[PDB]
């Protein structure tokens, strides 16, 4: 797969997922909406607390760390490519052509409803990016041996790289064993993915995908030494299906180590 990703293109990966339809978020129905509050009501709950935390295969996007940021004063966002990066480092330091968070911000600050502006919340999580890195979740040391992170970390978000850079269920299974190394015992893990997805695009390239179910996810986070804390599902609507790919769901998964 790694030569696929490597005509990736991250404009037409945003375009395709975080801007309308899927982008819309004014529809409390949509993917994004959803998403956002899985994660706001988990970081509610205040035990997925500490020092740092990493996000996995951040690719050219924000959002998995907006409710998250609050809770952690170090935070390392990583991915396997250097054009990702670059956009991720476009953002974060306000230069042209970044892409807007701006309507996932607000409702960031909508859903956790703390009063917050969303200027402040893109504001906090700018300030707490320590890093940008990469990453191969295939290598059994996925970020390097002398990595600026801190190691291990308290904890760990990921949303949509797993499966979508496995060929199969057990690439899938060894690349968490992977990641679940960088978390320090008892640490929390945070995954989002697509479920029964096969492919999507990004541009000139064609991505494989290796679709999982719900109980898959759940029999592969127990086998890495989890205890599944929770563990939804949102199934994909008829009017977020466009072409781009062929999702079905999408899970979420908060996962603590035993
Ligand atoms: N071997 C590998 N290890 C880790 N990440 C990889 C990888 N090969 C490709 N990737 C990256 O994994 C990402 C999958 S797209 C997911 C993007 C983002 N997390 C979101 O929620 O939308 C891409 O950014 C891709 O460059
Ligand atoms: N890789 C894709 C899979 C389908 C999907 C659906 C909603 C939000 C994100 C995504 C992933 O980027």
Same mark, same amino acid.
């Given at each position: 797969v790694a030569s696929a990703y490597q005509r990736f293109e991250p404009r037409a990966y945003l375009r395709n997922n975080?801007?309308?339809?899927?982008?819309?978020?004014?529809?409390?129905?949509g993917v994004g909406p959803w998403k956002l509050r899985c994660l706001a009501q988990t970081f509610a709950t205040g035990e997925v607390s500490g020092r740092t935390l990493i996000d996995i295969?951040?690719?050219?996007?924000?959002?998995?760390?907006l409710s998250a940021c609050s809770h952690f004063e170090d935070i390392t966002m990583t991915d396997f490519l250097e054009v990702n990066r670059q956009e991720l480092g476009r953002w974060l330091q306000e230069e042209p052509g970044a892409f807007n968070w701006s309507m996932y911000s607000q409702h960031a600050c909508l859903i956790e409803?703390?009063?917050?502006?969303w200027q402040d919340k893109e504001r906090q999580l700018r300030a707490r990016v320590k890093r940008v890195l990469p990453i191969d979740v295939?290598? /059994?040391? @996925? #970020?390097? =041996?002398?990595? /600026?992170? @801190? #190691?291990? =970390?308290?904890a760990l978000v990921s949303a949509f790289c797993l499966e979508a850079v496995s060929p199969d269920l057990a690439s899938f299974q060894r690349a968490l064993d992977h990641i679940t190394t960088?978390?320090?015992?008892?640490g929390h893990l945070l995954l989002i993915g697509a479920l029964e997805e096969s492919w999507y695009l990004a541009g000139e390239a064609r991505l494989t995908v290796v679709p999982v179910s719900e109980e898959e996810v759940r029999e592969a986070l127990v086998r890495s030494?989890?205890?599944?804390?929770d563990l939804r599902t949102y199934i994909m609507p008829a009017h977020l299906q466009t072409g781009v790919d062929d999702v079905k769901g999408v899970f979420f998964a908060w996962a603590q180590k035993v």
């Open positions: 975080y801007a309308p339809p899927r982008g819309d978020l004014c529809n409390p129905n295969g951040s690719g050219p996007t924000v959002y998995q760390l409803g703390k009063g917050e502006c295939h290598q /059994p040391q @996925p #970020l390097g =041996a002398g990595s /600026p992170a @801190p #190691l291990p =970390a308290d960088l978390l320090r015992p008892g030494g989890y205890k599944v804390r």
